């Protein structure tokens, strides 16, 4: 037997999105299992290269979570997203970061 859990993907900035001021974009990918996952931060569609992320960990139900984060300077023209691929996803899920949030 084995349990498969679909990742929860939440995208949020560390500070208010002030177009021009540096900031941090966080993608929190939680509640997934098994551990193999592919997380990418995307600026306007292409993959960001300067992406840090926490060490893998897991909740009390044994599901895993990860925090990917990057410094970024948001602008009006820019759209930022988090793309997660996992065995539970037929195809990668992309969650756009709501600047207006």
């Amino acid at each position: 037997a084995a349990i498969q859990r679909t990742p929860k993907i939440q995208v949020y900035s560390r500070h208010p999105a002030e177009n021009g001021k540096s900031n941090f974009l966080n993608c929190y990918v939680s509640g997934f299992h098994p551990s193999d996952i592919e997380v990418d931060l995307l600026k306007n569609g292409e993959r960001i290269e300067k992406v840090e992320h926490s060490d893998l960990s897991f909740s009390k139900d044994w599901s895993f979570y990860l925090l990917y984060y990057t410094e970024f300077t948001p602008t009006e023209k820019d759209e930022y997203a988090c793309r997660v691929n996992h065995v539970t996803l037929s195809q990668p899920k992309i969650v756009k970061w709501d600047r207006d949030m």
Partner: protein, 279 residues
């Protein structure tokens, strides 16, 4: 007033040759230790991460971890290369101890197979998980009979070494563990939950400790309609929290987000919804 320290290990067995392991140490929710798998060493994430243990003691801990990794992988792979269709599979281990109010230590050692509870170490005996029986019962039998010093070592680690190390860690990192970081709070307009309707959003980011109270209110009446999000992590050990409320436009004036946190020292954070009302 309760504190814990955990060592978590995650093993992915891909085939009868390959298997990758990860490990970390956690004081409550703050990661204090990583594990370098190439050198097989503890990574001290903070200046105080050695927790008043000697370099000899910590290098010996690394020795024991390396031997335990070797033997654990060896025996599991030995059993699994006979069931190769079972590959790939994941094993998770959560060991450690909780210091209870009054200073009472409760150690624990829990193992999951493929994200399902496999077994635990209760008092001084391996206990299989109810459900997931045959493999649990088997492993529990092997652990309770063949593997001698494994059991005693586990008991002494989670019952004596873990709480001593935990209190040494709290003593060494007193300034970081008991820090108070004032949050930043701002307002925004989320997606229209309908025409005329209006989604007020209140963000509270950058706070430690994790406990926080966020609520939309008009005066003292807390709006029962506030939807509070999850407490999400920022990097560098602060937290983020969104609380939303959809109201009727024109009834949004006078609403205000309210944030209480220990770091505030009483003077709570209040942010009134302005919208297009301020020239």
């Amino acid at each position: 007033e309760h504190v814990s320290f955990h060592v978590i290990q995650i093993f992915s067995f891909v085939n009868q040759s390959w298997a990758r392991g990860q490990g970390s140490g956690w004081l409550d929710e703050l990661q204090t230790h990583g594990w370098d798998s190439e050198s097989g060493t503890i990574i001290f994430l903070h200046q105080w991460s050695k927790g008043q243990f000697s370099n000899e003691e910590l290098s010996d801990l690394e020795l024991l971890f390396r031997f335990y990794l070797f033997g654990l992988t060896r025996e599991i792979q030995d059993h699994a290369s006979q069931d190769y269709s079972k590959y790939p599979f994941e094993v998770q281990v959560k060991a450690g101890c909780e210091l209870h109010s009054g200073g009472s230590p409760e150690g624990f050692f829990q193992v999951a197979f493929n994200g399902l509870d496999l077994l635990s170490f209760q008092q001084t005996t391996w206990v299989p998980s109810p459900g997931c029986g045959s493999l649990a019962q088997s492993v529990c039998h092997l652990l309770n009979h063949q593997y001698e010093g494994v059991t005693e070592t586990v008991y002494n680690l989670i019952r004596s070494t873990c709480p001593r190390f935990l209190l040494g860690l709290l003593d060494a990192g007193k300034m970081y563990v008991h820090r108070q970081v004032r949050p930043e709070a701002w307002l925004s307009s989320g997606p229209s939950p309908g025409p005329g309707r209006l989604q007020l959003v209140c963000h509270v980011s950058g706070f430690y400790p994790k406990p926080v109270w966020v609520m939309w209110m008009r005066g003292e009446q807390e709006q029962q309609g506030t939807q509070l999000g999850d407490i999400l992590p920022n990097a560098n050990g602060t937290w983020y929290l969104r609380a939303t409320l959809d109201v009727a436009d024109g009834e949004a004036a006078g609403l205000s987000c309210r944030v209480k946190h220990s770091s505030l020292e009483g003077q709570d954070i209040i942010l009134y919804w302005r919208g297009s009302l301020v020239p």
